[PDB]
Amino acid sequence: HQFSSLRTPTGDISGQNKNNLISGKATGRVGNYITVAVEYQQLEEAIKLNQLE
Amino acid sequence: YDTTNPQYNSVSRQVEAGDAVSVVGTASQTMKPNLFYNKFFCGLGSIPLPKLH
Structure with a gap:
């Protein structure tokens, strides 16, 4: 919040203006999925795939 | 019948053009062979x- 002040020799604020509580909000949102996909065959797993990690 | 490496021979003479060949059995019979x-x-x-x- 932000405000403003008033000046008066004695402090009489009868005819002055007073600050209001204006509320503001900042929005956050989600993005897009990051997806990495691979595929391969069981025969290849059996006869060719080593050091898979 | 290698002529530069005689040590691997497995047949007395080299087969060449004009030789006579045969096929065992008769024309089109069906049989169960023995092994x-x-x-x-x-x-x-x-x-x-x-x-x-």
Whole structure:
């Protein structure tokens, strides 16, 4: 919040203006999925795939 | 019948053009043959298969 002040020799604020509580909000949102996909065959797993990690 | 490496011969004379050949049996009969073989003629093995995800 932000405000403003008033000046008066004695402090009489009868005819002055007073600050209001204006509320503001900042929005956050989600993005897009990051997806990495691979595929391969069981025969290849059996006869060719080593050091898979 | 290699002529530069005689040590690997397995037949008395080299087959060449004009020789006479035959095919065993008759024309188109169906038969169940009988087998005879050494231990070290044909091998056999099996490949294990990994579990599907």
